[PDB]
Amino acid sequence: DNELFSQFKYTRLKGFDYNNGDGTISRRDPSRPILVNGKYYIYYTKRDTKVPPIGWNRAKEATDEIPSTDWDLCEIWYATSEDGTTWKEEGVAIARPEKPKPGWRSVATPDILVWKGKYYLYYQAFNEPSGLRGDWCPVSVSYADSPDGPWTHGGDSVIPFGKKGEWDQDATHDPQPIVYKGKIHLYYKAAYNKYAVGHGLAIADDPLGPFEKHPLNPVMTSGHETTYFPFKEGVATLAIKDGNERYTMQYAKDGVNFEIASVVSLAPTAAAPFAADAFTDSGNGRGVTWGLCHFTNASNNPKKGYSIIARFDCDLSLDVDDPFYKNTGVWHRPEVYFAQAPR
């Protein structure tokens, strides 16, 4: 049967503290891990703030200490691990720059590119507390000679928005590049129109750009989030629609035209698969068995919101056939049901 079908199993990470879950510390949107000198490295949004987020709808009340949303007032931090489950949080990778440089308010939602022996982080740059009035968080890039720092600012707004009226015109969220067909292929997302969510491709020969939009964008018309990895000579994705249990693996022979390969369930949010060959230009993608993800509803109390990062394992790999991941049913214990309570 189907090489892009799998189940997902979850493991709590070791090594990250969250002030006992009081909403003042949050880690989310981890990057796909890379392996360098026998350590995995990951980069993620990290918030550490005096008070938990005050709410989108109250972005008015945010100050330089009080965040409006979970991703406001953040930096990008990084961690190393030998086995992918126990992590050591190392320190800041991307600090917010000085006001009013883009990002001065928050840098968030990173992903990694390895290119010609240097390391590049792409991430969203915020200039105002999120939720006022409408966003504008274009993508910045920084770079380094080492997976540890130090990191040097590279550019701001490095993915062009679209001309007025295009689907593309206000956003390039979640930048995520792979190396495909000898070029940097960077996927990203934008809500448009009853809003829908598109995914686009932007291509460059230079990590600092320029990046040019693919003429078929939006390459996908469905899916609140997606994550991509080289697979055979194409590109596979996991696609999620937020809140419903319709999750699909999709596959494009050309990295561009996507067709459903499988329907999966309980799939990770902000999934960040490890793939040895993400940046390798194989033409021969082997697929994946583990990576990181997040949960944004870590707290019970929505006035003390935070997120945590977590690990998933799966079998979406050509070099592994593990029937433990190939069952077709899901069984929840009664507590899961009692957590869906009446009013």
Residues found near Ca ion in the complex (CB under 5 A): 29, 270, 315, 317, 320-321
The single residue among 57, 265, 284, 301 that binds its own copies, judged by CB under 8 A, is 265
Residues 6+ apart with CB under 8 A from 198: 167, 168, 189, 190, 191, 192, 217, 218, 219, 220, 221
CB of 3 to Ca ion, least distance (A): 5
57 binds its own copies (CB under 8 A): no
Residue 202 sits in the site that holds Na ion (CB under 5 A): no
3 annotated to bind ligand? yes
CA atoms within 13 A on the CB side of 262: 18
User: Rule CB under 8 A: is residue 215 a binding residue for its own copies?
Assistant: no
Residue 157 marked as a ligand binder: no
The binder of 317, among Ca ion, its own copies, Na ion, none, by C-beta within 5 to 8 A per type, is: Ca ion
First-last CA distance in the chain: 43
**Residues whose CB is less than 8 angstroms from the CB of residue 235 and which lie 6 or more positions away in sequence, other chains included:** 178, 180, 185, 228, 229, 251, 252, 255, 285
Among 18, 55, 157, 222, binds its own copies (CB under 8 A): 157
Q: How far apart are CA 15 and CA 12, in angstroms?
A: 10
- Residue 264 near residue 5 (C-beta atoms within 8 A): yes
Residue 206 touching Na ion (CB under 5 A)? yes
Known binding residue 282? Answer is no
- Tokens for 338, please give them: 């009692």
Q: Closest approach of Cβ 2 to Na ion, in Å? A: 36
Q: Out of 133, 194, 215, 319, which residue is the one contacting its own copies (CB under 8 A)? A: 133
Tokens of 30: 């981890």
In terms of Cα–Cα distance, which of 244, 249, 247, 268 is closest to 259? 249
339 interacts with its own copies by CB under 8 A: yes
Return d(Cα 171, Cα 76) in angstroms, integer: 20
204 contributes a contact to Na ion by CB under 5 A: yes
- Binding residues among 308-327 for its own copies as defined by CB under 8 A: 308, 310, 313, 324, 327
**What's 267's DSSP letter?**
P
The binding site for Ca(2+) comprises 3, 315, 317, 320
Rule CB under 8 A: which residues touch its own copies? 7-12, 63-64, 97-102, 104, 127, 133-134, 136, 138, 156-157, 160-161, 163-164, 210, 242-245, 265-266, 295, 297-298, 300, 308, 310, 313, 324, 327-343
The binding site comprises 3, 315, 317, 320
